């Protein structure tokens, strides 16, 4: 076995850059070292999927012919949206799956999401891959492919478990990426009038590249929206794992948002049920979510993380400030932007009033857009340390399970660093301005007496 880069090894998943540091070589060995993984689990069977990557067709043969070679029984979905290799890894036989997929990023990046016997790797288990190929600790077997065409399946459980009242227009924008595959035919199908906006797969991604997170990437969207008088606009990132919304009159639903809309419906039929969302929601959340009767647990960002943390409390709800929303309820647990959008479009369905005005009924705080400070890789897991054990944030609840929050009683602010890039991500949100000033004042001075040479670009 080769020496691959153990940069591409992250906290959630692999993610590299083709030619650079991914390479066909690279999805063999990654593939075998799943493979290997899955039998120590007792898993022979595997599901492999891929996205609508250029990169996909030449880096998915070598992936399916790694877990082969160990003497695994794949089933090759093709290529479909992430959410639906999930759905194949809890419905074929095997329970372990593996997506070769580069979520929301430019063309070149590929990597792969990985379920071993119905977990989810992170952190030291996807390390254990990477050990797996560096001490050749690999299987050797004679394996097998099938072929499943699962797409229609996932299609026919979604539109037979939802049920829309009346009619919706609704504008789809899936940014040339793979959830033009079945998201625009399934929400026509679940009684909707659909208008496409980059919904031909193409992974050279001319249009807007697939990352609902920013505004900018739904400015079309919503010029779309408005222009067609449609009731809702709904945009995929990449891969098909993450939603973005906009309502009849353009307003962004950031997905903490949405997730109240989504905790009411779960906690109405499910009375005591644990709702998770990130350490980048609103508090509102909090409150909402115990006011329902529901009990809110704070946990850590990525999708990974939170698909674990599902398993620990049994909660039939999660959902994530970047637009990963997973239902347990009525569902199989795993992120999914298009069951999702089937989802909200049910409950909006059954209310007279238009999606701006059901969204506008929750509380609302003034937010910032995400901030980000480039450090080092090497470097910003000590800074969270540093603060952590240093910092000094006033009177407020603490929160370390991920960087360090503080929920002050008229807001809250956020440090932590990022798994999937060099930078420190921060996030602050108050009752008033002059609060908002408060709180980031006070991270602004904690952040310089760990180094007083940190931008502090806020
Ligand atoms: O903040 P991080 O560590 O870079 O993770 C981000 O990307 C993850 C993968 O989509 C998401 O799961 C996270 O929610 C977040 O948007
Ligand atoms: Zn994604």
Known sequence: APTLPAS???????????????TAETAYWIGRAIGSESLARGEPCVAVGRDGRLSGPELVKQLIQGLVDCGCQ????????????????????????????GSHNPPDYNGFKIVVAGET?????????????????LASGVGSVEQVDILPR???????????????????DCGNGVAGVIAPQLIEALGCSVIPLYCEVDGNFPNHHPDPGKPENLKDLIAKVKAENADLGLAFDGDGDRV?????????????????????????????????????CT?????????????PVMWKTGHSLIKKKMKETGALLAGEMSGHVFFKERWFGFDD???????????????????????????????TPEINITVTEDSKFAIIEALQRDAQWGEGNITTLDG????????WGLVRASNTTPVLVLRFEADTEEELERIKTVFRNQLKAVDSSLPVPF
């Open 8 to 22: 591409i090894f992250r906290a959630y998943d692999i993610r590299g850059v083709v030619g650079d540091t991914l």
């Open 154 to 172: 996932y299609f026919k459980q979604i539109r037979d478990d939802i049920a829309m009242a009346k009619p919706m227009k609704v504008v789809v």
């Open 74 to 101: 794949v089933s090759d979905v093709g290529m479909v949206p992430t959410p639906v290799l999930y759905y194949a890894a809890n419905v074929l036989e095997g329970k372990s799956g593996v997506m070769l997929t």
């Open 404 to 411: 360090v929050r503080v929920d002050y009683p008229k807001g």
């Open 244 to 280: 973005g919304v906009v309502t009849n009159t353009g307003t962004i639903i950031y997905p903490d948002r949405l997730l109240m809309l989504f905790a009411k419906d779960v906690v109405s039929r499910n009375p005591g049920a644990d709702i998770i969302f990130d350490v980048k």
């Open 337 to 367: 932007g298009i069951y999702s959008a089937a989802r909200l479009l049910e409950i909006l369905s059954q209310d007279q009033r238009d999606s701006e005005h059901v969204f506008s009924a929750f509380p609302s705080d003034i937010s």
């Open 283 to 295: 508090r509102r959340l909090i409150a909402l979510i115990s006011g329902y009767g529901g009990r």
């Open 121 to 137: 790797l992170a952190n030291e288990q996807i390390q254990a891959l990477r050990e797996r190929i560096e001490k050749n600790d």
